[PDB]
């Protein structure tokens, strides 16, 4: 069934599961033509496939060449997503294949279900959570590898850096979604918070700065404050 | 013209024959239905005055035998049976007519309704969907589930409709996932028509039989099957032109005959709105669309 606030801790049990977010697969800029009509230009995108228990991220880069000569691209993007997710599962050894795939947008259910017909025992699940994975391209190193790609490419990351050496999956996931929620609501302020102090650096093999435990407490509170301020602004509350 | 005599009518029952129906009182001297048109299948069905659940009845074709009805006080239902003694049967039919204890199949000469509803329905195909090979006629009732329903419990009593499933390997060629899911033409024309049904007439026959069982018995799995076979055609971009024109006629007469009060459980909103207004064949069902809009605009 659908994933919601009630069955939230299932994400951190030992049943392998992946989130799939397709929000950044088909990305365009909208511009005016010489004749004054509107046209789009595609830019590179990505499928965001994440194991919330381990932090392993399978970032499949979608190169603009995929779209060449194709129609109804927003619909095609959903099927390309499902094709690539299915190829990923096939590429994994049996004991690493997920038992569930949770799609962040309900429009992905039928395409993934059809692409996964060969895996009848992998459950394809929607979610009611309003997860902020669209802000993945606010993470500088992820945006950079996507935009520099010259061809289709799979790039692997751990989205939790080394946090799991010190905190649990549940807490790691709460931090990730907090950071991304903030980046989504006000990217400039979120990024200021994360980088203000120049003495706290990002390891070459990490995505986020090397905060101490106490500094993460301060960061998380600043992100909370950011998110509440922006809410008051949005609704005049 | 053929006859289906009744031994007696011990319990108050509403008797249907095709789209017609008569009320018969407990131990009323009722002894059959005469002047039944030869050349079509027929269905005689029952609903007891005491149990408006369980409508039930028998599909039959008078060319295949002499059939009659007899109430069974143990099983408590009107049973169809075959009489093999041709002389004993003419004798009963003649004496009951002489005594004028038989209703006449009340067909208006202008009326092709029953023909239009049963055009492709063959008794031999019915007997493969309702498997009971010792009888020439077939029992169906409100509660019988289909084989596909059974997959998601007693197989002897199942409706063996052809299984249609849009999210299955059968329907989806590897490597053509998106193409085949959005354009079911492959599934319709190669898998179903050429593969399984062999021709469009057998397909239409099952579709018509499914509709009639849903209408006459409120059989829910039959209604599911009727809608699936409509949706498969309407969701195919490439359909033989003769099939589209015939489908428009088939559906028109089905919608025409449906009881107005039943349009709520018998018509799947999503399928009809998709077929009439979204599908590849939105513009190919002009008669069906016109009657749906003037009779059931709420559903749309």
From Swiss-Prot, chain A:
Membrane spanning residue stretches: none
Q: How does it assemble?
A: Component of the U4/U6-U5 tri-snRNP complex composed of the U4, U6 and U5 snRNAs and at least PRP3, PRP4, PRP6, PRP8, PRP18, PRP31, PRP38, SNU13, SNU23, SNU66, SNU114, SPP381, SMB1, SMD1, SMD2, SMD3, SMX2, SMX3, LSM2, LSM3, LSM4, LSM5, LSM6, LSM7, LSM8, BRR2 and DIB1.
Q: Which residues form a coiled coil?
A: none
- Please, what other remarks does the record include? Present with 468 molecules/cell in log phase SD medium.
Domain text: The MPN (JAB/Mov34) domain has structural similarity with deubiquitinating enzymes, but lacks the residues that would bind the catalytic metal ion.
Region feature (RNase H homology domain): 7-237
- Specify the domain of life of the species encoding this protein: Eukaryota
Localization of this protein? Nucleus
Taxonomic lineage of the native organism: Eukaryota, Fungi, Dikarya, Ascomycota, Saccharomycotina
Q: Which residues of the full protein are shown?
A: 1836 to 2069 of 2413
Q: What name has this protein been given in UniProt?
A: Pre-mRNA-splicing factor 8
Disulfide bridge map: none
UniProtKB/Swiss-Prot annotation, chain B:
What's the PTM story here? Phosphorylated on serine and tyrosine residues.
Q: Which GO terms describe its cellular component?
A: cytoplasm; U5 snRNP
What Pfam family does this protein match (any one)?
AAR2_1st
Record note on what altering residue 236 to A does? No effect on interaction with PRP8
Annotated phenotype, changing residue 236 to D/E: Disrupts interaction with PRP8
Q: What is its main location?
A: cytoplasm
Record's keyword terms, sorted = Cytoplasm, mRNA processing, mRNA splicing, Nucleus, Phosphoprotein
Mitochondrion: is it a keyword of this entry?
no
> From which residue to which does any coiled coil extend?
none
According to the UniProt entry, which residues carry Phosphoserine?
236
Q: Which PANTHER family match?
A: A1 CISTRON SPLICING FACTOR AAR2-RELATED, PROTEIN AAR2 HOMOLOG
UniProt subunit comment: Heterodimer. Interacts with PRP8 (via RNase H homology domain and MPN domain), competing with BRR2 for the same binding site. Component of a U5 snRNP complex that contains at least the U5 snRNA, PRP8, SNU114, AAR2, SMB1, SMD1, SMD2, SMD3, SME1, SMX2 and SMX3, but is not a component of the U4/U6-U5 tri-snRNP complex.
Family according to the record: Belongs to the AAR2 family.
Q: Could you tell me what this protein is called?
A: A1 cistron-splicing factor AAR2
What organism is recorded for this protein?
Saccharomyces cerevisiae (strain ATCC 204508 / S288c)
């Amino acid at each position: 069934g659908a994933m919601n606030s009630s069955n939230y801790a299932e994400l951190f049990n030992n049943d392998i599961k992946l989130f799939v977010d397709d929000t950044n697969v088909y990305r365009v800029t909208v511009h005016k033509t010489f004749e004054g009509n509107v046209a789009t230009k595609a830019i590179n995108g990505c499928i965001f496939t994440l194991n919330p228990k381990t932090g392993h991220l399978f970032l499949k880069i979608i190169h603009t060449s995929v779209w060449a000569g194709q129609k109804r691209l927003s619909q095609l993007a959903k099927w390309k997503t499902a094709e690539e997710v299915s190829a990923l599962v096939r590429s994994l050894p049996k004991e690493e294949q997920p038992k569930q795939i949770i799609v962040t947008r309900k429009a992905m259910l039928d395409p993934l279900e059809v692409h996964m017909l060969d895996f009848p025992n992998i459950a394809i699940r929607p979610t009611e959570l309003r997860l902020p994975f669209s802000a993945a391209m606010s993470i500088d190193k992820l945006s950079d590898v996507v935009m520099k790609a010259t061809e289709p490419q799979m790039v692997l990351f751990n989205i939790y850096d080394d946090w799991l050496d010190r905190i649990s999956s549940y807490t790691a996931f709460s931090r990730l979604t907090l950071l991304l929620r903030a980046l989504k609501t006000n990217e400039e302020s979120a990024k200021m918070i994360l980088l203000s102090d120049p003495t706290i650096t990002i390891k070459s093999y990490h995505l986020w700065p090397s905060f101490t435990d106490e500094q993460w407490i301060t960061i998380e509170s600043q992100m909370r404050d950011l998110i509440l301020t922006e809410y008051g602004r949005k609704y005049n509350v | 013209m053929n006859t289906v005599p009744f031994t007696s009518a011990p319990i108050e029952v509403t008797i249907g024959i095709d789209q017609y129906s008569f009320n018969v009182k407990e131990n009323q001297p009722f002894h059959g239905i005469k002047d039944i048109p030869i050349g079509h299948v027929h269905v005689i069905h029952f609903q007891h005055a005491d149990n408006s659940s369980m409508r039930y009845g028998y599909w039959f074709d008078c060319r295949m035998g002499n059939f009659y009805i007899q109430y069974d006080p143990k099983d408590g239902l009107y049973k169809m049976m075959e009489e093999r003694d041709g002389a004993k049967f003419e004798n009963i039919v003649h004496n009951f007519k002489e005594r004028q204890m038989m209703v006449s199949y009340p067909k208006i000469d202008e009326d092709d309704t029953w023909y239009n509803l049963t055009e492709f329905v063959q008794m031999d195909k019915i007997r493969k969907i309702v498997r009971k090979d010792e009888n020439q006629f077939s029992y169906v009732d409100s509660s019988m589930t289909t084989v596909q329903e059974n997959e998601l419990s007693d197989p002897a009593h199942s409706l063996n409709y052809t299984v249609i499933n849009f999210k299955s390997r059968e329907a989806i060629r590897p490597g053509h996932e998106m193409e085949d899911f959005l354009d079911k033409s492959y599934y319709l024309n190669t898998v179903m028509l050429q593969g399984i049904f062999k021709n469009s007439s057998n397909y239409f026959g099952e579709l018509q039989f499914a509709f009639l069982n849903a209408m006459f018995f409120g059989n829910y799995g039959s209604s599911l099957q009727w809608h699936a076979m409509i949706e498969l055609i309407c969701s195919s971009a490439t359909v033989p032109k003769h099939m589209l024109d015939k489908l428009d006629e088939i559906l028109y007469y089905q919608i025409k005959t449906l009881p107005e009060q039943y349009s709520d459980i018998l018509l799947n909103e999503r399928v009809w709105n998709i077929c009439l207004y979204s599908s590849f064949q939105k513009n190919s069902l002009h008669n069906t669309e016109k009657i749906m809009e003037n009779k059931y605009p709420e559903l749309l």
